[PDB]
């Protein structure tokens, strides 16, 4: 079982840049290496199939090189429809194995999130559970830290985060942190705060609410 | 289309699923058909393949004894049956096609992939979502809808009747400890419109055949 | 003291074509007349000898080869033929002196849902010289990459199974075949008729 | 210049015990250490000093039997497998390796492809191989190649179910015979 | 009794039936269990057998691909499953026992037969009979009951609730072209008793849960 | 496939007679010959195995002799519970084969049948079909011939016969033939006649009726 490891895992580039993605095999596979492109939600499309051969219908800016254990997919003058995830895959030995992928994301200037906080609706409280939602809107890059402080007590293990794919228009991300607890544990406390740390913030930002109003 | 696959499947652990894949056109024309799955947020994993012109099938050792891939030349359709299902088998299963690469005398790359079939394996049962409001309180306000405790994927959500798309963010669902999915769809609007413009989120969950229209007002 | 032709034709199990079975017949009296009046043999052709002059001639040895193949493949059991069976399973020489007998056996060789026990060889580097027998199970390298005994792409198990269902066309139905080779040598003949 | 041990252990198909397979090993450098630190081999008995000794030839025999039948792969043993399928000599100089293979050798509904010999007139001398399909005459009447009463097909199937006890589970076995002769040795280690 | 069999079976053409055979002794020891069938009005015909102590099963050439004989040592019960049933398969299936006859080193005779299991294969469906009178008109007179158009076997017939048995003849059923059975139960009586004695035939068809009591009066 | 042929097919005997049943094999089977007894409705019972060995629990009056191709089952002083069908069966070669059987029936004096005929009941006519029954009562021997004549037209293939087992008390047989046709075809004709011929009749006797009465 040959392990195909790609580098880097993520990469940030802008339109018209030269991007190189390296793929290494645990043992020699000659030139039996393929490169595939995949976009979120859709099926993969073949790009390169003989370490270097261009699949019919693919622009010339894509080129594969390498042999043995080291391979490189190079795209010169990156284009808007080229932001996607790229996988390398070997065909020398069964079973065929893929790499973990390389996501090529749009590069833009640092943008701070707009932070909003939502207490649980009275309906959900009457149901028996309480969901507090914290929303970070239209930020870049995606590396952000979100902590919950309930009466200045740090929460751990009772919140779940969710991130969107990069927006096509402003090239930003959005994130939602949901703190879920029981009606009793929710009514045990008063001040609920979402504490956010991001590169585009001079200092961490707090958005809070009081349980009565 | 060039390749179409059967619709999504929901199965309890221990059951079996059989996915279909029809090759557009009349025949297979000596192509090879392989099946590759992708778990949520994971990589691609080969499971097995078949050569309809030859009538041969191979499988990976990780899936020996569980998978059976077959082909029907009459309908030009390939099938893949996976039995003794587990939670780890929940994934998107692509059906891919390989041409005979004469320069190397065999099949060495996938040249065309089908859209994919989602197979969800979980102890949960089909349940409709509960949608709760996230009311609002530069001058931009945020509001939204929390669709909680549904199974399985997916749900679709729009705002008003599709007339509001600017500023809408529907987050990918998350899988809670209960085994049910939950997500939240938010939207930013001007504060001036909070009183004059009405905002309704419409949620559709097809597995449970539920449709809800929830008004979001500030109170 | 008759020859054990019942053992060959009337056996409950036949071998698969890749492992074709050979029974040596010698020191006995063979009555071939049971062929003509059989009226239940779909294929009966003799090469290098007259079909009716068998009871009058003696041979030093007689060899009965037996196996099972499909209907439309019976035509491949003949001198100078090509195809999967003649190239990779059972090859008769050009100078072949003997007979080929075959009959439909759908009732006792197929089964509902398919009988996948009868195999045939699908891949081989070279062809079989006459009366060669290949029963090796090494994975065939059809591509340009090594297999190392691991099945997968371009690496196929050399034996494939027959799909014998009772509701197939006669061409895809199981057929039992017996190949009688008559051997004449500088030695006392031990297989005669009347 | 390594030895093709991957061909033997990591192969997708193993032979059935009555038709046990023999692979000849010669003219290569063998790394035997991977056996000890594997810690995933249920059976490993010899009848650590292997990497320093060389042999003119090495013979690897491979097949599949049940769990509780592995004990029969040893010098001076008796049983169905040791009497009718695979007999090790008393003077045996070699090792025996076996491991559980239920995941890749059984299947839901049963795997009836692995066979074993159930009847034979005499016992097997060491390293003999019987692959005949002759109908066994168990009675005092001739069989004439017809199955029925007192006339049994000599080969029976195992029937490997995924939910069987470890004794009734399929186990892959490798038997390494070391041969020393008046000739240059061609299988060494470091 | 040393061997007991499952009760009768009715199966549509193309289905499969599985008959059981329990050894009253507790185990099989070194016995062999075989299955022999007998069609209506025909002889005996061996189909297959099993030697549980050895774990072997043989089958007749006429039944290869359709029959499967198995044994369960825990319950000491033998089973025989016959697939792809046909109208010709309608018969009584006996399970017989064979001991190891040391003087000939094998199994060479049947030592005990089970009562037998009737398997009826027909396209017809369970239907109750119609009971009609066969009245007398003229010193011994004859009268009776015509039990017509039922399926499957059997039906039982008595007269005057078992009080009349002398002179009664209940004929074995016959199978008409319609695929339904029909029979007649008659009785001879003195003519003098035709007016004074009441005659009633009682017919019972348990498969259809029909029971009829018909008076037979002259004319 | 060895063909066992038994002789005779039927046998008529009295209580206390010496009965011999012969069985011939198409080829030598040494002493691999068994004799079974079977009574109507019941399972077969083993009598003799290995051509001459008596099965324990069988009366000593049963004895088997013979070897090779000719075999004989002997019953000295036939008893009432011995009237049955006897089968010989070879175990030499697969498949094992049985004989066609030999039926031993009670012998008695010739007795003519009592002939009765029953027109279809008005109830059954209301049902839509008409069944005419002809009854042969308490006759011997079992060989009897029954023909149907509808308006002097011989019927063929539209009647079914049924015969009883030999009666235990008077050792006689009874037979019933049913002529089945449709109500319309029944009302199309007038004279329905049952013509029976039997050994105990000087000439065939006819029982007929006219549809009115
Ligand atoms: C295999 O067995 C068949 C049935 O037992 C034989 O067929 C029959 O043989 C008889 C002679 O005993 C013929 O009279 C009959 O017409 C039918 O063909 C068949 O001969 C036999 N084959 C051999 C080679 O013995
Ligand atoms: C067999 O495959 C495994 C998994 O890739 C590997 O660790 C091992 O080295 C291979 N060779 C053996 C076990 O001889």
Short note summarizing the structure:
Chain D: Disulfide bonds join 3-28, 46-95, 54-188, 143-151. The complex is a heterohexamer, with two copies of chain A (213 residues), two copies of chain B (219 residues) and two copies of chain C. With 219 residues, chain B is mainly β.
Helix content of chain C: under 10%
Rg of chain C is 18 Å
Count of DSSP helices of chain C?
4
Number of DSSP strands of chain B?
19
**Backbone shape of chain C:** globular
As for the number of domains of chain B, it is 2
What can be said about the biggest beta sheet of chain C? 5 strands, antiparallel
Count of beta strands of chain C: 11
Oligomeric state of the chains?
heterohexamer
C-alpha-based Rg of chain B, rounded: 22 Å
Overall structural class of chain C, as computed from helix and strand content, comes to mainly beta
The arrangement of helices and strands of chain C along the chain is HEEHEEHEHEEEEEE
CATH architecture of the largest domain in chain B: Sandwich
